[PDB]
Design a protein around this ligand. Sequence first.
Ligand SMILES: CO[C@@H]1[C@@H]2OP(=O)(O)OC[C@H]2O[C@H]1n1c(Sc2ccc(Cl)cc2)nc2c(N)ncnc21
Lengths: 627, 150
Amino acid sequence: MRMILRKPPGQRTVDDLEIIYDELLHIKALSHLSTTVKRELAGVLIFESHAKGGTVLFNQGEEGTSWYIILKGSVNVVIYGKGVVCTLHEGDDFGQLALVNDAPRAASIVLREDNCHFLRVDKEDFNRILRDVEANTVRLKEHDQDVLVLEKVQKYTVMSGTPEKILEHFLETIRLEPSLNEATDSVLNDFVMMHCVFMPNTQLCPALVAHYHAQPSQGTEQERMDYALNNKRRVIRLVLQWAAMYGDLLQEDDVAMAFLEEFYVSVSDDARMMAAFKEQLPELEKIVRQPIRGSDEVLFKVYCIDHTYTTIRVPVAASVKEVISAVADKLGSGEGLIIVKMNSGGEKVVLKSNDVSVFTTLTINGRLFACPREQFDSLTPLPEQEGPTTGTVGTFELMSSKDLAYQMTTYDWELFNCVHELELIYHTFGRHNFKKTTANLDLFLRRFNEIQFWVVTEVCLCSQLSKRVQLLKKFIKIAAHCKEYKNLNSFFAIVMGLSNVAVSRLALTWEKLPSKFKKFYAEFESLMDPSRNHRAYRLTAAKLEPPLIPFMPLLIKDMTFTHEGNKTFIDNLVNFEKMRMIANTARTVRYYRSQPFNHQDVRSYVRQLNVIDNQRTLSQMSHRLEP
Amino acid sequence: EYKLVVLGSGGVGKSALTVQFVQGIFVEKYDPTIEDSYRKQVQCMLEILDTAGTEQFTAMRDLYMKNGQGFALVYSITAQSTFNDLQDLREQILRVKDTDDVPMILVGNKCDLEDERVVGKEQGQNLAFLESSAKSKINVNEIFYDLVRQ
Ligand SMILES: CO[C@@H]1[C@@H]2OP(=O)(O)OC[C@H]2O[C@H]1n1c(Sc2ccc(Cl)cc2)nc2c(N)ncnc21
């Protein structure tokens, strides 16, 4: 029987195959498979025996060659830095992960007892028979606790797991071959971007250090030195991708910078000693409007009820608690101050001590107030908040539509490029959870409202009907040119400004507008159609090549619904499926900025807009222009 | 074809209600980037236009108001200020659509938690009215049924 199972595939008789098959019906690891598969396996399953407990079947890090089933005995699953993580018994199978995913062995398999019998299937036989029909799920357990779940979405991809195991997995599967550079970086990207949600630097950096110094427990002296070297290479690779994601943002993280400092010394000491890391060492050496940083200091005015103010000097990433403290220090307080945002329209929001970097979350004409709670309802807006009372047509009317749109797009791109990919993550998951600023994203998102209200402001301040018709024509022209430059954001901002109740009201102005521009606008407004998840916009943006600025409000909506619609944790494990979805949305922004984009007076106007954002005032102004 | 709009202040449960109606949290992953993300068949097709995440963009709600046919005014029973904010949104609908009457439903979300209630049932009926919960599946479907009738 076992002699039969020792015979090579092309040497077994018909009766041999017939008798092997009969026994395969008793093996539980095969029972879910079809007769067709079982008959094929009958001519392929090799019998294997080992005498001594403690014999190593294969090492962690080795290339996978075989799938195993246990007939007699037991084995231990051994991972470096953890030891025996799991034990497998009679009936259990293993070694499928390396074969399916074309990855190194995620663990070592060591015999637990004497005299163990196995059934084995080699690589090319496994691929043509088992790979396509094996199973949809692989659950990895450590100390009888769920630790990693891999599924078919073809390879097994990470669906869920513990932060430590997810890190371990992405460390192990890094490919160092130069021709696989972009594939390696692409695979790591989800973890490198999303780790701040489930494994902050406080946990990641010590885990990285530990992984770097983790020596192998199995194999010959040469096998061990070769593994440790490649282990170190992969850690460096992950560190480089990790550092690249942050860029200048590392300066906001003392733990991350301290880690890099000591990591660079460790690598360079190992480089000298082992004559290695010749390519990776200089890369690591390099690392060791402008974007606003959290550590930057702002002079900010916080107003009293009587409209006097204090100027505080605090970091951009300061909490409300820190703001209160800075105000109290100047006024000499112990009267229980609270921080409250106020609109030009007078509506007020009380901020929690918890909130971070609130300065840039204000409305266009918003102001920040410090007062005791009993003053909340008596607060009233400042004159400065109520916007201009005379138009600026006499200035920008003298400027070309093309020149205005171009200067707008140039400025927009400066604001858009200042936005770090991680600010999107912090904004979605909650600013206070990271203690980081989103100032750059905050200011770029506000710009949408600024352009929108600029249109409404100028139209509602233009008293002459003939000149007002000229304004509508000009705004449609500026919008058209914005779409040409692939600045979809500012395009929709102008169109929505034209859609505003205070502007659409002006029947006498719209009626007197040439039908050429009347149809032009109707075509613009139809691109705003919210039907089929903004299908009209979606397709428009998809056709365009990658130097473009997207419709930002929709991006923020996509991000919001990805967060609220999906659980971050499932059964105390990180839902990496969700993490992948958030990262895909952020990478879309990376795609839009993957290519560069190609008159001081026109520049000055566009970058210094004065706007009314009080909708009531705009309606009142519109109602007396055309009763 | 029907287009329904969800309105209300931040932290009210708008997105939770929308997802819970179209598909469902946990049971299935939610992709908000595909054609049928906010569409559900009930015998007619509905599209939910939710202002969740885009509250700071006033032009977004205005666009949804113009295209909307039914409206859901949602507030939290745990938040005092959120019921107050509904008066403006109510009048804004009649302003953007430029109509006298509009088919709408008033919704008091988060009704599952009573130990944090600061807004009693009292105030709702005076201004149809439902006390719903997204996370507890109370009256989720009912909200969007009223609007198709109206
Ligand atoms: C699917 O088989 C797994 C691994 O596949 P592999 O080819 O990476 O080689 C080591 C094998 O040990 C098995 N293994 C096991 S045991 C096992 C778990 C699930 C299945 Cl379907 C089969 C066996 N636990 C592991 C763990 N916590 N970490 C890493 N590997 C574990």
